[PDB]
Amino acid sequence: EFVPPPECPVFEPSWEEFTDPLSFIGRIRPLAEKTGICKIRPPKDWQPPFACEVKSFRFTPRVQRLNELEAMRPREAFGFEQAVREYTLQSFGEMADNFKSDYFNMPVHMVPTELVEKEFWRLVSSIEEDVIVEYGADISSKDFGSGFPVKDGRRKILPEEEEYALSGWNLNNMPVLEQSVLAHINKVPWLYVGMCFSSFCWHIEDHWSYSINYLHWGEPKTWYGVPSHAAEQLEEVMRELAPELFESQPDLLHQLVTIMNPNVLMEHGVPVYRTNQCAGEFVVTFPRAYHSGFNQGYNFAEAVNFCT
Ligand SMILES: O=C(O)c1ccnc2cc([C@@H](OCC3CCC(F)(F)CC3)c3ccccc3Cl)[nH]c12
Numbered sequence: 233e234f235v236p237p238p239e240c241p242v243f244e245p246s247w248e249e250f251t252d253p254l255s256f257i258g259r260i261r262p263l264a265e266k267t268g269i270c271k272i273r274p275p276k277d278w279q280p281p282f283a284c285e286v287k288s289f290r291f292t293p294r295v296q297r298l299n300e301l302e303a304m305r306p307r308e309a310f311g312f313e314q315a316v317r318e319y320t321l322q323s324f325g326e327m328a329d330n331f332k333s334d335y336f337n338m339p340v341h342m343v344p345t346e347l348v349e350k351e352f353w354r355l356v357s358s359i360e361e362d363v364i365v366e367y368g369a370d371i372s373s374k375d376f377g378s379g380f381p382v383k384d385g386r387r388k389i390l391p392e393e394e395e396y397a398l399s400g401w402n403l404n405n406m407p408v409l410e411q412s413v414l415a416h417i418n419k420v421p422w423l424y425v426g427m428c429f430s431s432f433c434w435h436i437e438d439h440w441s442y443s444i445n446y447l448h449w450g451e452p453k454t455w456y457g458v459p460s461h462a463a464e465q466l467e468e469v470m471r472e473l474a475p476e477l478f479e480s481q482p483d484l485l486h487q488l489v490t491i492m493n494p495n496v497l498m499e500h501g502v503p504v505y506r507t508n509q510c511a512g513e514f515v516v517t518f519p520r521a522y523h524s525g526f527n528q529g530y531n532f533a534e535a536v537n538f539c540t
Pocket residue numbers: 367369370424431432433434435436437438445453487488489533535
């Protein structure tokens with residue numbers, strides 16, 4: 233069965249340390265950059281309201297066949313394996329909980345995180361079982377608003393919520409402009425509505441950028457991370473073991489479909505760290521830190537790349 237990687241570092245900054253995100257990330261860097269990813273729990277009283285326009289929030293999630301790589305005799309009428317469905321936030325969550333509770337035959341919050349993890353990686357490599365889920369991924373915060381309150385005049389902000397619209401940990405307030413000469417001669421957060429087994433495969437950010445990720449609410453998001461000093465070793469393991477049909481593809485295109493069990497990387501000398509990102513917690517990925525993961529259940533996340 234799947235062997236869980238060691239836990240990545242978790243930081244619980246004081247109110248004084250929480251005053252500056254870039255300053256705090258710079259101070260934890262000597263440890264966190266050696267693990268690729270880290271988790272940051274804000275102070276207990278720091279609780280931002282959910283500011284998405286929930287009434288009109290509608291989306292068509294992408295279909296994810298967990299064993300699509302392992303399944304590579306073509307199936308009859310391949311390409312039409314799933315009917316397309318549009319959801320609201322409510323109807324997607326009702327579908328999400330029904331799937332997980334039917335799959336494990338128990339209430340969604342009673343399923344151990346270790347069990348969903350072991351089942352996810354078994355299904356990914358299983359040919360005898362075709363599990364298909366949906367992921368509301370890469371939803372632009374410009375469509376229905378950010379999960380954080382923002383002072384843009386498009387939605388009401390209560391006085392007790394103004395501190396969160398101005399907070400440096402509001403992902404809409406992270407610095408995103410990279411310095412360059414072209415910037416003298418010449419990005420918003422993305423949203424992720426997850427369900428059980430919805431996943432994102434191994435990748436690094438464009439320009440080897442940092443990324444910060446916040447889980448607004450819902451069941452945990454399980455992460456795996458690799459430190460940047462082992463980036464070449466992971467890419468070598470990919471070249472050796474990933475499907476040879478995709479071997480010559482550029483990294484940007486390869487990264488779309490590169491799922492790999494973390495135990496395979498660990499067996500080949502790649503250090504891997506895990507964490508369960510719970511509601512209200514941050515996850516920071518450092519430059520060129522390969523990361524991947526899946527969702528334990530119905531949740532809502534927001535992510536953006538930032539510059540230092
Ligand atoms: O789902 C999450 O919580 C989550 C957390 C952290 N990182 C990611 C990345 C993604 C998606 O990739 C978006 C692009 C953006 C442009 C890029 F940065 F150049 C590459 C990645 C994706 C990647 C493969 C398979 C499914 C999905 Cl949805 N989801 C993430």
